Symmetry: C3
């Protein structure tokens, strides 16, 4: 018989939590925690908004000293540098790429205003790593947190060296100069305020269109993890994000859990697909619902991801592989 892989029409993957640390104490504790939990979350060593101002050179060296060190056990430690209109952004790239025992897992670019700004920064990173004789290119992630970036967000998603786009909620709200209430930086405003909801969906649609990872902003709530876990669920199940920032180690497990695979999907996919197979991939009826190749795709996507990620697939599903 025919397999779904050969009859059905036609994805980006990074760890689901991006944990930010902007000071040495937090970096070291995060790194230690990553060793305990394993690489279920990335760590971003932050030079920008997560850090105080004034020690820019010293800070980039601190960051560089941790990359590929004894604390970086999995190679899942990236960085965020300064913005294009900042004096130290090239110095961040040079200091960090020169001194890091291993290159950062990715470089996060904040406050992109124009498409050319991002491309130029991506290009400088490539050039620098090329001359330092670094083996592979360094992935870049872009913040979409200005008017300019949101307007051209599809152009950003399309950029070659860019693996993900992240929403900058606070900067985006602040960018409206008070026209959007600060309640939009908290939940549920950050999901329900029409302009913020609109921006999040643009970023998400753009990422999916170009096979990039849509990364959700942090929850600034540092007490109620119940809120944080709910944010992560809405980002995932309503907004189509596949990753989310963390700003406190207690957020990490709530976020990772929210993005865990739903194993409940696997038996359903198996049943539907086996039946589809028997109907020669023509339309079928399942539980008062019509299915055809357009929905089969979904369930094959579900089975494919499950088997790939070494999740339990029913023996019945064998003739689909």
């Amino acid at each position: 018989a025919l397999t779904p892989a050969e009859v059905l029409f036609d994805p980006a993957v990074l760890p689901a939590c991006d944990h930010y640390a902007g000071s040495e104490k937090l970096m070291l504790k995060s790194l230690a925690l990553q060793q305990q939990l394993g690489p279920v979350f990335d760590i971003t060593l932050d030079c920008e908004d997560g850090a105080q101002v004034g020690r820019e050179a010293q800070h980039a060296e601190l960051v560089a000293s941790l990359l590929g060190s004894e604390h970086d056990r999995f190679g899942r430690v990236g960085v965020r540098i300064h913005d294009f209109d900042h004096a130290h952004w090239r110095d961040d790239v040079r200091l960090i790429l020169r001194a890091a025992k291993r290159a950062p897992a990715y470089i996060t670019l904040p406050k992109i205003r124009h498409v050319h700004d991002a491309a130029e920064m991506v290009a400088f990173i490539e050039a620098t790593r090329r001359e330092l004789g670094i083996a592979q290119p360094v992935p870049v992630q872009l913040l979409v947190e200005t008017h300019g970036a949101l307007t051209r967000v599809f152009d950003l998603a399309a950029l070659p060296g860019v693996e993900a786009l992240s929403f900058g909620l606070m900067d985006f709200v602040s960018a409206h100069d008070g026209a959007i209430p600060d309640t939009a930086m908290r939940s549920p405003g950050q999901f329900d305020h029409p302009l913020v909801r609109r921006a999040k969906l643009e970023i998400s649609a753009a990422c999916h269109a170009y096979g990039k990872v849509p990364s959700h902003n942090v929850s600034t709530e540092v007490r109620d993890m119940s809120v944080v876990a709910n944010d992560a669920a809405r980002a995932r199940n309503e907004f189509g994000y596949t990753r989310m920032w963390s700003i406190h180690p207690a957020q990490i497990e709530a976020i990772v859990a929210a993005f865990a695979p739903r194993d409940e999907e696997i038996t359903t996919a198996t049943e539907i697909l086996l039946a589809a197979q028997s109907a020669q991939w023509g339309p079928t009826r399942y539980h008062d619902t019509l299915h055809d190749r357009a929905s089969y795709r979904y369930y094959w996507s579900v089975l494919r991801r499950a088997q790939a990620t070494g999740r339990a697939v029913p023996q019945d599903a064998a003739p689909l592989f």
Copy 2:
């Protein structure tokens, strides 16, 4: 006095139901039903997802044999062919246009990824019908059900030989590789899931912008017609669709009814417009509400459609024509 037609600033129309049949038995039963009900719905003879795979040539000939036959009583029978990246799509066009006693009412193109893909297919259809000496061009309808089509959906709406765009809900959800839950293929998820709601509104706005018909996806619910009728109402009254696909003959009357004209609108339009006329088309007050030429347009659109479609217009409305 002055008529609305001469003072007011400044539409596409197809049957409101597009009934799909992908097998001979269903095609023949649909055709028979169309003869009974008259052409209140179109029929699309389906070569793609509504049909099993493997008999592609035989299937296109079956389809071609029904077009303009004794069963095709009104010329309101179209087809859906294979996609641009499929081997048999040109063969579908040639086999069907060559053998059909009368050309299809339209040709539906599934899974458009790029604007050039669609244009090229539209162009091949024109060329083929031109060489076969077919008298008029064959209208094309495009599925918007990929990332590429949604991104450039306004460019699609603008294409010259394209009369309508249809939303492919299942393919669109599947296109997100699991990021959108399968609950978004069912109601109310298919209206309330932010990314699906977003896609539907883009397609709709694009169609209206370029005078094309926005055609809504089928309800996959084949038991509860109450659900199907509600879907059709939301597609119409919230999303601005003017047509909807049917996948089961029991859906057809629910869909056709949902898109029926609201005669309640006609007396209101008459009253408002006659009063506007007397105020020399300056602003008026009607029921605690201010009206001016911007709203008069709406009510003239309502009267114009009613009189055109031979619906009952009050004798009082005479000085508006």
Copy 3:
């Protein structure tokens, strides 16, 4: 220590109410009311939909006679002229600019279909005022109330001589030829109908992206001011509009109040920023919530606007200036 102005990353302002009058009696009463209340609202002397048809030349002269007259006390009186596809639009510009003792505060262009249409009209206004030896250029405001304008609404926001975009709700609904129910011209439909909500957010995002004023459509409700006041609140707090049209003098105070500054914001901003300052503009904790430079921006925007507009700022905030 360091001030927010020197560490933080990175606005258009017009009166919050745009009161329309399309007849001499209403213009004169509006002008008198503006003298009483002071310039808390603009007045637009209307030649288009707010006026009856047929006296076009006489009407433009009436309008021109009031600009800069004894009734125009503050220079906050603009006009709306006819559309690009109208015969009298150039005549409106010439008659009005030639005869007005002082130039209009702005010129509102209705029913823009294409970007070039608007640019061309903006250019004619510049040319005319230049040859009449008028000292400064006349600001233009564009109506976004057609399909063509909404599609290219970001291109419109970007136009050099354009200070604001206004949503034309009734024309926009009417533009869909009945596909959008007339209930979308009333509240809550005008906020909740998905296509109208979508259009309003596009206009708003575009204006903010290019530093223009987003101006909300009028409430056509002329009895219940409670409705009007609620409309203004949703336009402001959900949709990000900073101005709203008025069509009845009783609407004016409800609209102006809805857009009044929230003084409650000032102490919060002060507290957060003073603390940020002490942490060397690194991240801080405030009330179970994490803050960093991305949110500080918001609160600095709040303080800056308060001090500028001569509102009461706490003595504690001194080291932030």
